[PDB]
């Protein structure tokens, strides 16, 4: 059930490898992943509350092109009507591993699978008993920002012999980054319980309390950016949010031949915040309730010279929402509040029936898994100001096929093709687009590639193909859906690791690694824009580094690097003056770190000092459509420290 045997583009990093790069936030761990692009805070998502991610040149603003899940539960506060992770109730420190799947997904996962299926694996409940705790502090000396950024995780839990267990997972953030007006406060509280009375029945549960607020720096005009890169010309922009998650799960397994699982989940999420929208400053609260019950049965049975693992599954989901918008003339110093004019009061919703079925077939050195997923989406929006009521319902057949060939006991070949569909979001109901109407978003992906492993050389490489019927943006500034039409995403994803010790003792416990990805994202639709590279899609993006482990020491050397990219569908090459429009530099950065594991016994106490961007080279990223569009100063040389304690 673990990757090397995946008939597709897949990568999964484990906890024991987050520290490697001084990583402390989802973003940072995913950006090492090939073909994955995860920009530093910028725009609406200008804070550590939101998550920005995208693969294969797909727009990574607020991850809306993917299916991100924590323990199978959907992270979003609408996975249908508002995929955008303005708020991302999730903390790296509470996870034991990140599983990013670019292709060949069980068709258990969807609908918006086209942009990859990212699932976060919350830390395992300890066997008998335990306590882990860790921290990391970061500083950007060369910034006018002196207060540092601390983060920390705490783990307490265990399992009584009666077959019951519980873990209290905690993760939180305090501090500001290298930009003024970035003061963040995050508190992610989780209560993970499990119950295995025997060996057939098992019950699991998950309760979560994520509360958070942050000051958004936002972008800069050029004048201001050169004047002082650290400063921020957006003093009103703020963002805060809290999520409450509850999930109950039970699995019936009488033998290793059949398996029944059923998971239910409820999550209430509220996110709102201050923002400056042209001579008006707005308070925008948005609540979301999301129910979901999901049963699925599996069975293994042989047929002729073939092994069959039929997987069946269902998922009913219900998402009701409420979003309002209070506003005030910026000319005043006054920030908006309740009892203040509101120009937007609505209630949207959706009821989605999904069905999926696949059949893993084994035969010789072949594993063919022909599957199909089907969704019946019904979404409605109710404007309380206009009174106008709208509705939507589309059916989405989703064929899928995976084939894996076993060349050797250490080399596999694979190929696949799965599809997706994005139901019209509540933010697109009034389909005011130039080419008729908005959505849906139908896409298909094709992957071809190989994976190799031999205990000294571990590598992979694959080619992909993604066809998009259309793609729409947002332009929060004016509240209008700028389209893009059809696009075709093609490229190659590769990475490798090696034990430079199996060549000579002198390099014993030395390891070098590198990943790379070439991505060609282009517009294929109608007019003026045809033939253009999609915005924010470096063609070239990868990493390279080395790991040395003499005794309990750990020495990490690594570099990041990426080509240039455009901000608009126009492909404008000259900076716009506000800083939004404009080609964007590529760059290569260098980072290192030194850690020691004080007596793997004692208290597994670990310490480590590391520098980020040793050369303090300069770079930046633009935000084009967000109300705070501008130049976002790139992370400068950062000195950080980590500390782990286990009991
Ligand atoms: Fe927004
Ligand atoms: Fe908006």
CB-based contact 449:9 (threshold 8 Å):
yes
Distance between Cα 625 and ligand 2 center (Å): 10
Distance CA 418, CA 25 (A): 30
> For residue 440, which of 449, 450, 448, 428 has the smallest C-alpha distance?
428
CB-based contact 176:157 (threshold 8 Å):
no
Distance between Cα 538 and ligand 1 center (Å): 24
Which bound ligand lies closest to the C-alpha atom of 44? 1
Distance CA 344, CA 87 (A): 20
Sign of CA dihedral 13, 72, 48, 424: positive
Query: What radius of gyration, in Å, describes the C-alpha atoms of the chain?
Result: 24
Distance CA 218, CA 40 (A): 11
Distance between Cα 118 and ligand 1 center (Å): 22
Neighbours of 211 (CB within 10 A): 17
Distance CA 581, CA 202 (A): 54
Distance between Cα 276 and ligand 1 center (Å): 12
Distance CA 616, CA 556 (A): 18
Distance between Cα 212 and ligand 1 center (Å): 17
- Secondary structure E strands in 364-434: 366-383, 389-408, 411-422
Q: How was this structure determined?
A: X-ray
Distance between Cα 601 and ligand 2 center (Å): 52
> For residue 413, which of 106, 9, 7 has the smallest C-alpha distance?
7
Please list, in sequence order, all residues whose beta carbon lies within 8 angstroms of the beta carbon of residue 218, skipping any fewer than 6 positions away.
43, 46, 181, 232, 233, 234, 237, 623, 626, 628, 630, 632
The secondary structure of 570-632 as a DSSP string is T---S--SSSSSS-B--EEEEEEEEEEES-TTTT--EEEEEEESTT----EEEE-SSTT-EEE
Distance CA 106, CA 110 (A): 9
Question: What residue ranges define each of the domains in the chain, with the CATH number in brackets?
Answer: 1-128 (2.170.130.10), 129-647 (2.40.170.20)
Kind and range of the H or E run holding 352? strand 342-363
Burial class (CB in 10 A: 0-12, 13-18, 19+), 304: exposed
Which bound ligand lies closest to the C-alpha atom of 480? 2
Distance CA 248, CA 396 (A): 28
CB-based contact 97:404 (threshold 8 Å):
no
Question: Which residues hold their Cβ within 5 A of ligand 1, which is an ion?
Answer: 44
Distance between Cα 166 and ligand 2 center (Å): 40
332's torsion region: left (phi>0), alpha (psi -120 to 50) or beta? beta
Task: Supply the DSSP symbol for 3.
Answer: G
Question: Which residues hold their Cβ within 5 A of ligand 2, which is an ion?
Answer: 476
Burial class (CB in 10 A: 0-12, 13-18, 19+), 475: middle
Q: How many CA atoms lie within 13 A of 280 on its CB side?
A: 14
Distance between Cα 283 and ligand 2 center (Å): 12
Distance between Cα 515 and ligand 2 center (Å): 35
Which bound ligand lies closest to the C-alpha atom of 83? 1
Which bound ligand lies closest to the C-alpha atom of 427? 2
């Amino acid at each position: 059930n673990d990757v090397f045997e995946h008939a597709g583009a897949r990568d999964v990093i484990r906890r024991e490898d987050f520290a490697k790069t001084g990583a402390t936030t989802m973003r940072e761990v995913l950006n090492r992943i090939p073909g994955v692009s995860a920009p530093e805070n910028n725009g609406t998502g200008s804070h550590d509350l939101a998550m920005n991610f995208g693969i294969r040149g797909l727009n990574p603003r607020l991850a809306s092109r993917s299916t991100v899940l924590m323990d199978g539960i959907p992270v979003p506060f609408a996975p249908y009507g508002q995929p955008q992770l303005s708020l991302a109730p999730v903390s790296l420190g509470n996870m034991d591993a990140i599983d990013v799947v670019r292709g060949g997904g069980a068709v258990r996962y969807g609908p918006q699978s086209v942009g990859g299926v990212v699932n976060f694996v919350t830390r395992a409940i300890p066997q008998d008993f335990g306590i882990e705790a860790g921290v990391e502090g970061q500083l950007s000396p060369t910034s006018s920002q002196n207060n540092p950024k601390e983060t920390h995780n705490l783990m307490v839990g265990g399992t009584a012999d009666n077959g019951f267990g519980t873990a209290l997972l905690y993760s939180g953030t305090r501090g500001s980054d290298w930009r003024e007006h970035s003061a963040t406060r995050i508190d992610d509280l989780m209560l993970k319980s499990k119950y295995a009375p025997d060996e057939v029945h098992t019950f699991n549960s998950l309760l979560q309390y994520y509360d958070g607020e942050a000051d958004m720096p936002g972008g800069l005009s050029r004048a201001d950016y050169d004047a002082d890169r650290w400063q921020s010309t957006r003093p009103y922009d703020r963002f805060w949010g809290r999520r409450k998650l509850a999930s109950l799960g039970y699995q019936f397994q009488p033998d290793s031949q059949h398996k029944f699982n059923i998971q239910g989940f409820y999550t209430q999420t509220l996110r709102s915040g201050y923002l400056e929208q042209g001579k008006r400053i707005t308070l925008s609260p948005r609540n979301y309730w999301v129910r979901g019950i999901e049963p699925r049965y599996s069975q293994i049975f042989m047929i002729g010279p073939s092994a069959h693992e039929v997987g069946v599954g269902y998922r009913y989901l219900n998402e009701s929402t409420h979003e309002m918008r209070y506003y005030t003339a910026t000319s005043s110093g006054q920030l908006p509040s309740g009892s203040s004019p509101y120009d937007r009061d609505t209630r949207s919703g959706t009821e989605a029936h999904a069905w999926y079925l696949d059949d893993k077939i084994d035969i010789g050195n072949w594993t063919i898994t022909p599957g199909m997923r089907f969704e019946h989406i019904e979404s409605y929006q109710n404007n309380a100001i206009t009174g106008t009521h709208e509705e939507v319902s589309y059916n989405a057949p989703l064929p899928a096929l995976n084939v894996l060939y076993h060349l050797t006991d250490s080399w596999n070949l694979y190929a696949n093709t799965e599809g997706s569909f994005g139901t019209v979001q509540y933010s697109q109901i009034g389909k005011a687009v130039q080419s008729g109407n908005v959505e849906p978003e139908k896409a298909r992906t094709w992957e071809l590639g190989t994976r190799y492993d031999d205990g000294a050389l571990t590598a992979e490489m694959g080619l992909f193909l993604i066809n998009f019927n259309n793609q729409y943006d947002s332009n929060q500034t004016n509240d209008t859906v700028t389209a893009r039409g059809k696009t075709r995403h093609t490229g190659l994803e590769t990475q490798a690791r090696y034990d430079l010790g199996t060549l000579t003792p002198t390099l014993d416990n030395v390891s070098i690694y590198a990943s790379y990805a070439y991505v060609n994202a282009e517009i294929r639709e109608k007019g003026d824009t045809y033939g253009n590279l999609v915005p924010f899609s470096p063609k070239h993006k990868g990493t390279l580094g080395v790991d040395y482990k003499p005794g309990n020491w750990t020495f990490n050397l690594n570099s990041d690097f990426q080509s240039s990219q455009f901000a608009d569908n126009a492909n404008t090459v000259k900076e716009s003056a506000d800083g939004s429009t404009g080609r964007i530099p590529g760059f290569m950065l260098w980072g290192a770190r030194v850690a020691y594991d004080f007596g793997p016994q004692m208290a597994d106490l670990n310490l480590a000092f590391g520098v980020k961007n040793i050369f303090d080279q300069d770079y930046f990223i633009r935000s084009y459509d967000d109300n705070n569009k501008g130049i976002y100063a790139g992370q400068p040389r950062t000195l950080y420290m980590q500390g782990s304690l286990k009991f």
